[PDB]
């Protein structure tokens, strides 16, 4: 797996190039927003249980065919499998958030996930619904100003939403 620094290091190695000064400009401005990057993953981590539980609760309030008998969440073990599947994606999105790019998300979370749900008979579009319900729940929580200095971190919020989108289209 690679973070954002190791990614352009691999880019520069695979053509044997010294890193230009402008790329050092590009890396220092990632260093510049380090506390703001860390501030988000911290807010997602301390709310991780309520994110998954409220998103899952709102999923079955509007898709009640899943928890009714015969559905793909009608058990206690299929239901516990669903909650723990949502925590997996919330975990790996937060890994990709501090990595700076989605290598660890694509590599050991999303690779082969669509085929898994097709083999199990799990409806992948309803997984895609639950992922976007966690996405807006975490985004509105990352724009909360309690416990942080007053400033701008909107581009990082868009970067965070991009990972949820990438995980959403990867499982349909």
């Amino acid at each position: 797996m690679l973070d954002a620094f190791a990614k352009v290091v691999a880019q520069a190695d695979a053509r044997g190039e010294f890193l230009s000064n402008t790329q050092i400009d590009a890396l220092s401005k990632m260093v510049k927003e380090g506390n703001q990057r860390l501030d988000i993953v911290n807010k997602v981590t301390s709310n991780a249980s309520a994110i998954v539980t409220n998103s899952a609760r709102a999923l079955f309030a509007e898709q009640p065919q899943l928890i009714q008998p015969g559905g793909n969440a009608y058990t206690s073990r299929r239901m516990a499998a669903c909650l723990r599947d949502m925590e997996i994606v919330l975990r790996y999105v937060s890994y990709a958030m501090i990595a700076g790019d989605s290598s660890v998300l694509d590599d050991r979370c999303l690779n082969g996930l669509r085929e898994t749900y097709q083999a199990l008979g799990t409806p992948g579009s309803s997984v895609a619904v639950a992922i976007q319900k966690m996405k807006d729940a975490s985004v509105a929580l990352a724009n909360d100003t309690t416990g942080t200095p007053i400033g701008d971190c909107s581009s990082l919020v868009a970067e965070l939403a991009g990972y949820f989108d990438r995980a959403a289209v990867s499982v349909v």
Partner: protein
């Protein structure tokens, strides 16, 4: 309901602003490709019966649980029901493509469709597949890329309208999801 010309006046009415020459060129562009939208709607509604019968049979032949007894498309009456349940969907997407925005199918066809299929016991993910096949057939038709029957057109681009009918078909996916 609301068309594309009437979409900007309800936006300008919210601010008591006159519609002026700063946003009129987006409308004049929409008028300029009037014939492209017009031939595209015609190409949709020309071959619309095979469009429905192919999509429902393709939804059947991937999930043959509906044909089994206890299936929702089991009996003859329920298959006659399902063959029209998607023909209405195509009939309203053809309205939304002509009108230029997704307001005519939003409150007429899509409002209340979810609890109807929930209360009836219609499998929603099967209807998701049935309308995704119709979306694929639509982008095959209005790009003249159907390998199955070709129609004659004047040369040019039509992908701006092809993304439009794609964005209409996920609204039917989201509303019963």
């Amino acid at each position: 309901m609301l068309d594309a010309f009437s979409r900007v006046v309800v936006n300008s009415d919210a601010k008591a602003a006159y519609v002026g020459g700063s946003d009129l060129q987006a409308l004049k562009s929409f008028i300029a490709d009037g014939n492209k939208r017009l031939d595209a709607v015609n190409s949709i509604v020309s071959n619309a019966s095979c469009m429905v019968s192919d999509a429902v049979s393709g939804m059947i032949c991937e999930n043959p649980g509906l044909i089994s007894p206890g299936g929702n498309c089991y009996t003859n009456r329920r298959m006659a029901a399902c063959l029209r349940d998607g023909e209405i969907i195509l009939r309203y997407v053809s309205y939304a493509l002509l009108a230029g925005d997704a307001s005519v199918l939003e409150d007429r066809c899509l409002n209340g469709l979810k609890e109807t299929y929930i209360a009836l016991g219609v499998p929603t993910n099967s209807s998701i597949r049935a309308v995704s096949i119709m979306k694929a057939q639509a982008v095959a038709f209005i790009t003249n890329t159907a390998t199955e029957r070709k129609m004659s057109f004047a040369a040019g681009d039509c992908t701006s309208l092809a993304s439009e009918v794609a964005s209409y078909f996920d609204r039917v996916g989201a509303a019963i999801s």
